[PDB]
Amino acid sequence: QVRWKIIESYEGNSYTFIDPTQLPYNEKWEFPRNNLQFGKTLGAGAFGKVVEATAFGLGKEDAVLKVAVKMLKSTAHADEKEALMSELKIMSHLGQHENIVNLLGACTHGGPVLVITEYCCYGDLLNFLRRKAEAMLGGRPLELRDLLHFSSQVAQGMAFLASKNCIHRDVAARNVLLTNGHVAKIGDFGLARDIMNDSNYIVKGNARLPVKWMAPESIFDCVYTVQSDVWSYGILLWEIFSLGLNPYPGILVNSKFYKLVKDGYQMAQPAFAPKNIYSIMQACWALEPTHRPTFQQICSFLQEQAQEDRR
Ligand SMILES: Cc1cccc(CN(C)c2ncnc3[nH]c(-c4ccc(CO)cc4)cc23)c1
């Protein structure tokens, strides 16, 4: 599936004390439903939708501020309701981070469940990159430092998720939002996503899966770990440094594609990727999951590349 999920892991430095999806919910997040006014839809899919809203008296500082609200369609089945409560429980457990779309509140009584999160004013990274690529063909252009920042910001978010044993399962430039200062943030964006009508999501029987982004062990063996997410981050880095090309350009998803990937096929270096950045992608794409870098290793290598650019 493409929802965030806490996994049980002791390998290395992580320690699972509790799975927050196993327990009911923390009523500290409750917020008055009548103190939201809804605006336009930011996105929608099969069972859910996200709308921008103003929240009146949210948090200790009693601020008025613009937020995003996630909710199910009235047509949603119980399993969809459960999945939303699960996401709320995970987000209540993770704690805040600058590169996550943070939870701010929920409304879980007196009507349908609303999940209130930070609002990101610049929209998705992929469309941002594609507009900056388009501009080159006919304001200010991107620089290497901007692409390094985006890469670092996402890797810091992912390093945070990894430290809490949270797997993402849909890492892709389309699932990165940009907020004030064009800082990147990640979140579980499944509800905003029209997955059933998106050709990037391939039928795999029960499921619709972002196969071009997925580790071989995820595709073949239904294994889903942090190191699976590392593979996907490599695909994302390719998207960033290509200014938003579609992965595996012109290659159809089918049996030849699965065999390519299993046999060690890797996308070519993007035009705007330095060799050192391509080396991150190649490492993320190690066929053996244990030979891939950790998100912390990625973060600390990217921080060196950033210093070099600054010099
Ligand atoms: C990844 C993705 C893609 C589409 C919709 C969403 C909705 N969500 C969860 C959001 N969650 C939080 N903040 C948000 N800000 C926006 C947003 C979308 C477009 C634009 C116009 O450029 C601006 C903002 C979507 C959003 C998320």
Residue numbers in the entry: 547 to 684, 747 to 919
The authors write:
The colony-stimulating factor-1 receptor (CSF1R) is a tyrosine kinase embedded in the cell membrane of macrophages. The receptor is activated by colony-stimulating factor-1 (CSF-1) and interleukin-34, and signaling via CSF1R is crucial for the differentiation, proliferation, and survival of macrophages. Unlike most kinases, CSF1R and other members of the platelet-derived growth factor receptor (PDGFR) family contain both an activation loop and a juxtamembrane domain (JM domain). In the autoinhibited form, the folding of the activation loop prevents the binding of ATP, and the JM domain forms bonding interactions with the DFG aspartate as well as other residues in the cleft between the N- and C-lobes of the protein, stabilizing an inactive form.
A protein co-crystal of CSF1R in complex with 23 was obtained using a sitting-drop vapor diffusion set-up. A complete 1.9 Å data set of the CSF1R/23 crystal was collected at the ESRF synchrotron radiation source (Grenoble, FR, beamline ID29). Inhibitor 23 binds via two hydrogen bonds to Cys-666 in the hinge backbone of the kinase: the pyrimidine N1-atom accepts a hydrogen bond from the NH of Cys-666, while the pyrrole NH donates a hydrogen bond to the Cys-666 carbonyl oxygen. Additionally, a water-mediated hydrogen bond is formed between atom N3 of the pyrimidine moiety and Thr663. The methylbenzene ring points toward the C-terminal subdomain. It is sandwiched between Leu-785 and Ala-800 and almost perpendicular to the side chain of Phe-797 from the DFG motif, which adopts the “DFG-out” conformation. Although the inhibitor binds to CSF1R in the DFG-out conformation, the ligand does not occupy the allosteric pocket that is formed underneath the αC-helix when the kinase adopts this inactive conformation, as is typically the case with type II inhibitors. Instead, the 3-methylbenzylamine moiety of compound 23 occupies a hydrophobic binding cleft formed by residues Leu-785, Ala-800, and Phe-797 termed the front pocket. The methyl group of the aromatic ring points toward the C-lobe of the kinase into a small complementary cavity in the front binding cleft. Thus, compound 23 cannot be classified as a typical type II inhibitor as its binding mode resembles that of a Type I inhibitor. The co-crystal structure of CSF1R and 23 reveals that the benzyl group of Phe-797 is folded toward the glycine residue.
